[model samples]
Target: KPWWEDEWEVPRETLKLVERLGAGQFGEVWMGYYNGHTKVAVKSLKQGSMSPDAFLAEANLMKQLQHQRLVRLYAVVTQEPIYIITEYMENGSLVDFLKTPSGIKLTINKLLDMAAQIAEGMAFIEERNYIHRDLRAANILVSDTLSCKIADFGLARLIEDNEYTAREGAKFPIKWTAPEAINYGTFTIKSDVWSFGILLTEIVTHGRIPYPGMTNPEVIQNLERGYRMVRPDNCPEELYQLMRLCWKERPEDRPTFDYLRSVLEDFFTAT
Candidate 1:
């Protein structure tokens, strides 16, 4: 190791890509091994898919963003075709996990635990002054121990950088995003709160997509008319009420993650 080597930087030769886990237009995720035995997920970038500086900025951001409820970034290979190595969650995305029999067996307490863990993670994110523009069930990872941790930072940004620079065809799930973000690309923690509401619906419904029968444009149209998703039959009124709070029409009216965490955690003690 050089005197100038960053602690988080990994030597390229030490990483072994074992298998491709998934791929997107922007990048591919690989199941990788570091130093022989340690398993990790490797995010390999596609040239020009997104700003390289911004990509590396996420690596830098990850260095300070660690928490038990957030996926841990371990090391970065900043050489050409950059790769970011992070903790691998065996159960994969929450949405996918919820579709399985294993997830179906989860009791209400376990479900609320998932919600609280994510809110706890988001509280940390909110406190750190960051807006996770893409907070949704699909972006959350589940552990073998059945714990949930927020993941996928493809659209996270500082709250100060509130407005996402719209690019040709760039999109966040319209159903999960706030109206201000959808119409103006103006993202804030409030936008994240809006997305969290949709995620809670996903959890309660056991992985049903948001706005089940509505198309994206229809969902947006109804959103303008003050329509919100109906409560899942399995959802408690308290949880549904919390969801409605997250989906408030005005961003300022939406509860912060701090407040949401308090409410979700209290559910644990109430029962």
Candidate 2:
């Protein structure tokens, strides 16, 4: 058994561990080079954030889902500590890019294209029973060619209707959490729609953090007051209106990922 396997590990001999990727929660990720051309992201176990077994399970779960819009896990190294190897994205996290001087522009039509890609990805994941409870600008990765993919499933869960109530540890982005998720712990495909709307807002604003200055309660109060985000100067009115639909108070009011995809697709085609 490998040293890290004392924690009840799996066997991983293929991945060649390289430099560190970045820090998150309480752990750090390393870059692993595999097959020369493909780079894999290796998440090493942190001391307290997540147990080795949970990481193992997460890595295993990641293998079952497949979508070009989602990050891919290549393998996992099960030692006394765990090493998870996932597909390496080159352009860095969307949040980081937004902080840079020439990050990205949120044009009206481009957001439609972007939201379609994201919805398609989310729909793909939801179909497989996984909910990325922590969707945010930082979790969305952009490519050199401007393609987007959802990443970081550390807080992801395989939830069902019966157990809809979230446990204490699900780390949802406060700014992006659906109103239902905040008020009643109710989550569904609709919750994802709300989060996607927030993502659209981020793209429209070019990486500005949501409700940057407001407290959580205050932001929620504003949302409850029907204060929708003002569509930025560059966004198309139609697409922004769709964004408002996504942030509706009732989950049933939110559109399905597939439906959102089609709506944006048609909107872009019409213009």
Candidate 3:
């Protein structure tokens, strides 16, 4: 059976938009409620942007995939304006959450746990041969209990024939992208690993932007010449070294998400 066929198709009228959460290339995300009770995050796609088949395909994959560290898809509305409902994240994006008063009180151990949870989610995707082309702190959501769940699959694509062909000259996320992806429009699991390294910096710095004070062209040039962002203040040397590993020049040299998870697990254990 097609996965989406078995999932719930919630009526648009039943989804009450509470507030606009955020907006992205694909659509606007809103803090919404289903059946006027169950809180949810709703992503509404622009009308005519994606066909029903395409929407269902992506929705099915998301609904079928389940992991503790990954956000859960509850239902989808395939009507005029597409709506995807997922479990509500109380704290919202990791980026925004880190800047909040409650988030400002987080300790390094808490940050490490967040990173490990994200890595666990990424490891699951990597093991499944899927590439999260836009893996970044902004895409990670935090629950009320501070549990991190990797969200936003808008840029995610399954690895087919060992690689994904990104559009040439297509505007992509320069700050959180791998060198191979930025220059050659090539994407793979390793490229996602590179983004994950940037995310680590974001967490350590409490959601500071990566490549701060540098223009996109400057960033590309600097990366091309083997430069990366310096370690965030108070970041552990061990973790910094691992971040460097993720930003390795050669994709082959970068550690897999599985290996990253192990290293983080060990770090957590040692502490």
Candidate 4:
């Protein structure tokens, strides 16, 4: 590689590492400055650590798909240390927010508003024939006003028709997963709907993890026994009904994302 090669290939420079943003088994996310932006989330995957192709696919998808709800991947750079640049979310993950005092202290109305913004993001992804394989408050980024922008498209996949294949031993968000995804390794827009229900429960309960006392094995056991999550205390009736419809055992019984969006629009308008 020539001097010009590195310069052209890596258009952006790492000015300073502000603070750690997020971390996982694969790597850690850091807050950085790029091209003069203050709040930026920089994700670094270990070298030869994960599927390079998979990361590339996610980066490309984010670059092409522009929506107000999805996390904006500003740029992807290839260097010794590969990085994916994204706009910094000041409020951080909705998951983190709801877990904190500020989120738990909020009134019921505020919680609904948070859930509503999440639905808005999910609705946008469904419109593109894609499913956010993992839909949770944690994956959602919130704004100062509490609006949500769906972040972390790593687990997302574009659904082909009504069916898609899952990798051997692959999981599509079992906790927030739909019955079809749990019982079978298949997922669709409908399964995404199911996760949305779980997401609502998270918002209402202020970020309580699903199946609080249950183990992962127990969750599978209960799911096999036809278990279902209960409604949070005094959740809005219309929203509750719609969420129930999303969690139906049969994927075909679920409402389309378009239908859910309409219901939410009306619900927000009425209340």
* Per-residue lDDT of candidate 4, residues 1-271 (tens digit): 4426533234656445679866777777888887665667888877777876666677767765678877887666766467777877878888788877777788776666666667777778777878777887788887777677888888677776767767668755568987677666787888888888888878777778877777777877876687766566767777777778877877888887767767776676666
Looking at model 2, residue 12 earns an lDDT score of: 64
Per-residue error (Å), model 2, residue 246: 0.6
User: Against the true structure, candidate 2 has what lDDT?
Assistant: 0.74
Best by TM-score: 1
TM-score of every candidate: 0.92, 0.85, 0.91, 0.88
Q: What is the lDDT of residue 202 in candidate 4?
A: 80
- By TM-score, highest first, what's the ranking? 1, 3, 4, 2
**Candidate 4: C-alpha lDDT:** 0.74
Record all residue pairs in model 4 with backbone atoms less than 3 Å apart, i.e. clashing. Answer: none
For candidate 1, the 10 contiguous residues with the lowest summed lDDT are 160-169
Per-candidate clashes come to: 0, 6, 0, 0
Model 1 C-alpha lDDT per residue in residues 95-171, reported as the tens digit of each score: 99998999999887788878999999999999888878889898999999999898877677766654444564567
lDDT against true structure, model 3: 0.85
lDDT of 1 at 62: 78
Quote the positional error of residue 101 for candidate 1 in Å. Answer: 1.7
Off by over 4 Å in 1: 1-4, 47-51, 161-170
For all candidates in order, the CA lDDT equals 0.87, 0.74, 0.85, 0.74
Query: Candidate 2, 216: how far from true, in Å?
Result: 1.9
**Clashes in model 2: which pairs?**
3-80, 4-79, 4-80, 4-81, 5-79, 5-80
After the best TM-score superposition of candidate 3, give how far the Cα of residue 126 lies from its true spot, in angstroms. Answer: 0.7
